[PDB]
Every structure is written in C-alpha cells, then in structure tokens.
Amino acid sequence: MVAELEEIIQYKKLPQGSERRAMIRKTWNKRLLGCQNVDVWQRVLKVRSLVIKPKQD
C-alpha cells in the first residue's frame, strides 16, 4: 500500500492537470478498496497523504 502510494505520488507529481491521472489514481483507490478495514482506512488516509481532499473526491 505504502509502495503503491509512493509510486502514485511520483505519478501525480509528474502528472499535469487532469490527464489519465484521475482515472489512474481513482481506479488505484478502487482496487485498493478491493483488499478490504480500519487500517484500510489508515492507508486510505495515506492516499489522503497524497490527498487532495474530499474535494478531490
């Protein structure tokens, strides 16, 4: 989770505004939710470390 998060960070960092990044990270989050919990919400909060807020979605 941490790793994928890191790579994701690399991605969004690299990402210009809203190209392929939204879909990617979104699906990333979806599949992430696939593994299923509390600490699940913790790493979810790691996605939140990548953020952006409930704004972002």
The DSSP result for the chain, as a single string, is -HHHHHHHHHHHHS--TTSSHHHHHHHHHHHHHHT--HHHHHHHHHHHHH---TTT-
Tokens 């599949």 belong to 31
Method: cryo-EM
Burial class (CB in 10 A: 0-12, 13-18, 19+), 43: middle
* Angstrom distance (rounded) from CA 51 to CA 44: 9
| Cβ count within 10 A of residue 47 | 20
Burial class (CB in 10 A: 0-12, 13-18, 19+), 25: buried
Resolution (angstroms) stands at 6.7
